[PDB]
């Protein structure tokens, strides 16, 4: 009876396709899904979506070329997303062209952004939440940072990072420059740099396949710290990437719980029925898989929470009121339930941390949380 359309934005070929192409297949299966089973706003109107996947290779130009498509031939009112430089560099476009925009991109920059979701905490609390985890667990030390320097994703937590540092036990020993799309020797390299130092604790930034050389390298020349990684440099193809000499020494952050620990979980089994009813094999089912399925679930709650009068009167600002109006669950997905302020739509703060376990299978360690007293959203915020 109404249908919207709604641009979704991937990255299936490019240099963070690695995590890029499970996301967007979630995404899919959501939309296919939520249709399927029914949309329904508040007075009970049937809402159809029609979505249009558009693979931007992490282009910031395509980006750009695909959101003026998006608005001017489809007048969307609502976006999928994906990168961080894109992402920030179209937040005050999406506000004045008042369509939602919902991303991969957890950016602690989009937090003041009017327009900008995300069912997450933003990358420098997450960061903070897991370094917090090491200092707890394994004791005050040093930390290196791994992160590719030219790329916004890459910096994000960075600057909150070294300020939340001293308060945590952790002296930062070095800043080391591993490229997003980083080769064995550029991922040996950065180790044999960050063993000079010898760090207790590795940080990394970058999406796990740099992430994944870097761990294998820092065992094969001998650095014996611990790896922690952002939420994009870890998941279910870890073991396997790393190999055995990183068994019991990496660590990887999630907002999100994996499909292997989810079994009981309504939100997991919500993503099978989906993959079932779309002729998607159970072993597809993947962490990348649930990052794509909740943005578009978030997406759903907030239609079922507007009029139809309201969503064909004001479209995407209607939706963005109803993702401030309200406390969201994603089937119990999420660490925390989600709850955004007007002028900053900080979902939750806490993670799950995930062990690559001695044996080779991964672990889950339980929810983490960095100090209350440690902002660091504003610190990222406040950059410059
Ligand atoms: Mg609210």
Redesign the pocket.
């Given at each position: 009876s109404l249908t919207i359309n709604v641009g979704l934005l991937v990255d299936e070929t490019g240099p963070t396709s690695d995590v890029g192409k499970g996301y967007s297949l979630g995404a899919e299966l959501a939309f296919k899904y939520f249709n399927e089973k029914g949309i329904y706003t508040k007075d009970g109107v049937r809402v159809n979506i029609n979505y249009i996947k558009r693979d931007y290779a992490y282009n910031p130009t395509t980006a750009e070329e695909y959101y003026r498509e998006f608005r001017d031939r489809y007048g969307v009112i609502a976006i999928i997303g994906w990168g961080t430089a894109d992402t920030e560099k179209l937040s005050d476009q999406v506000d004045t062209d008042k369509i939602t925009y919902i991303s991969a991109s957890y950016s602690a920059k989009l937090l003041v952004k009017p327009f900008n979701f995300y069912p997450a905490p933003d990358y420098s609390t997450q960061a903070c939440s897991g370094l917090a985890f090491l200092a707890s667990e394994f004791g005050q030390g040093k930390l290196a940072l791994a992160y590719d320097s030219k790329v916004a994703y890459s910096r994000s937590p960075i600057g909150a990072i070294k300020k939340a540092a001293p308060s945590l036990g952790l002296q930062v020993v070095g800043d080391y420059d591993l490229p997003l799309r980083a080769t064995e020797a550029d991922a040996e390299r950065i180790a044999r740099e960050m063993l000079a130092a010898d760090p207790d604790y590795v940080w990394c930034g970058n999406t796990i396949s740099s992430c994944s050389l870097l761990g294998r390298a820092m065992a094969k020349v001998g650095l014996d710290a611990f790896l922690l990684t952002n939420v994009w440099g870890f998941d279910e193809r870890s073991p396997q990437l790393i190999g055995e000499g990183g068994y019991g020494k990496v660590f990887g952050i999630s907002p999100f719980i994996y499909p292997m620990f989810g079994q009981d979980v309504e939100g997991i089994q919500t993503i099978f029925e989906a993959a079932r009813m779309n002729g998607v094999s159970e072993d597809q089912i993947n962490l990348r898989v649930v990052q794509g399925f909740v943005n578009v679930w978030l997406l759903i709650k907030a239609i079922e929470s507007v009029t139809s009068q309201d969503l064909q009167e004001r479209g995407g600002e209607a939706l963005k009121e109803a993702?401030?109006?309200?406390?969201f669950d994603l089937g119990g997905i999420t660490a925390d339930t989600i709850?955004?302020?007007?002028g900053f739509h900080l979902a939750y703060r806490k993670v799950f941390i995930i062990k690559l376990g001695e044996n080779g299978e991964l672990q889950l360690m339980g929810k983490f949380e960095a100090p209350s007293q440690v902002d660091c959203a504003r610190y990222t915020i406040e950059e410059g």
């Open positions: 993702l401030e109006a309200n406390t709850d955004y302020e007007p």
